[PDB]
Amino acid sequence: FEILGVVGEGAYGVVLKCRHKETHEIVAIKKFKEVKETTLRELKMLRTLKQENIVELKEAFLYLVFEYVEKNMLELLEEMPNGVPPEKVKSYIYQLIKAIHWCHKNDIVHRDIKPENLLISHNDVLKLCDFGFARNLSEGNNANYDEEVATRWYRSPELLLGAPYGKSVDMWSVGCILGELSDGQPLFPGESEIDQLFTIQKVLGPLPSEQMKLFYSNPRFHGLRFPAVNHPQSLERRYLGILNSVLLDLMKNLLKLDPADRYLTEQCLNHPTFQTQRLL
Numbered sequence: 326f327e328i329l330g331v332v333g334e335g336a337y338g339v340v341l342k343c344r345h346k347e348t349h350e351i352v353a354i355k356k357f358k359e360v361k362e363t364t365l366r367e368l369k370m371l372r373t374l375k376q377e378n379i380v381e382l383k384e385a386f387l388y389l390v391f392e393y394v395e396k397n398m399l400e401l402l403e404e405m406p407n408g409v410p411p412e413k414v415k416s417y418i419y420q421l422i423k424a425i426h427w428c429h430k431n432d433i434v435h436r437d438i439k440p441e442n443l444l445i446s447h448n449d450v451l452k453l454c455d456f457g458f459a460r461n462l463s464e465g466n467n468a469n470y471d472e473e474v475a476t477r478w479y480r481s482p483e484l485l486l487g488a489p490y491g492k493s494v495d496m497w498s499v500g501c502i503l504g505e506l507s508d509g510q511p512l513f514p515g516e517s518e519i520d521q522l523f524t525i526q527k528v529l530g531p532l533p534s535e536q537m538k539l540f541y542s543n544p545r546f547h548g549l550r551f552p553a554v555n556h557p558q559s560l561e562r563r564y565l566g567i568l569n570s571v572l573l574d575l576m577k578n579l580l581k582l583d584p585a586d587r588y589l590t591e592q593c594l595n596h597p598t599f600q601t602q603r604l605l
């Protein structure tokens with residue numbers, strides 16, 4: 326394997342764009358910078374989680390070599406800064422939901438669903454990557470989070486204010502990505518986590534009472550004002566003329582402030598917006 330470059334580094338290890346010397350195959354090799362989150366789990370999590378919308382473990386040799394995908398969704402949104410075409414919004418989110426469905430069935434919450442970890446193939450096939458930050462639903466009791474700020478923006482209001490993290494928070498990330506794909510803009514951006522609660526409430530309205538109670542019981546937010554909103558702007562108003570109305574209905578169910586009301590994957594896939602997509 327010759328080394329062709331560095332794909333990325335961050336807080337998860339290092340991914341190297343490498344090429345097999347015999348076969349001119351660009352591959353993405355991950356090694357760490359076992360190491361905090363076990364490559365050993367990942368190589369088995371990626372032994373079960375083999376499906377067309379999850380990254381392929383091509384081989385392993387201390388560590389892991391993946392298929393190389395030239396692009397991710399983060400790059401797409403920079404090149405299409407006002408959103409990708411509406412048909413692509415439905416296609417990518419449907420593929421993303423399918424990958425989450427295959428993760429959630431084996432009781433794996435991905436925990437770092439963001440546009441960087443969504444690769445898009447030359448055939449426009451979405452593939453989920455970076456399972457290092459995950460937790461399986463048994464065992465677990467983990468921290469091992471991605472604490473990057475871009476990751477924060479895809480987190481549930483419950484997780485920001487201190488709750489456990491389950492399948493419902495993975496679905497909240499899907500709704501955040503649906504909106505960003507539609508107009509290119511981060512739905513819930515915040516330099517500070519508290520500023521995010523303003524942006525969550527400015528669209529989805531005042532928070533549930535359980536959540537606003539945990540706010541006043543948490544060390545991280547003490548001493549500071551609550552991001553209160555007089556007159557909220559609904560999702561319907563936020564994406565008026567931008568999103569197909571049937572697709573907007575899926576998003577509303579993805580972004581229920583109370584985690585209990587949130588759609589999980591089977592309801593999302595059987596949602597109306599995918600009827601013709603459910604054939605294709």
Ligand SMILES: O=C(Nc1c[nH]nc1C(=O)NC1CCNCC1)c1cc(F)cc(F)c1
Pocket residue numbers: 332333337338340353355380391392393394395396397400441442444454455456457
């Ligand atoms: O497996 C990962 N990434 C990849 C596998 N195959 N291709 C890629 C890849 O990132 N491709 C990019 C897309 C954008 N354009 C440059 C090439 C991976 C693992 C992590 F832990 C963290 C992470 F961010 C990515």
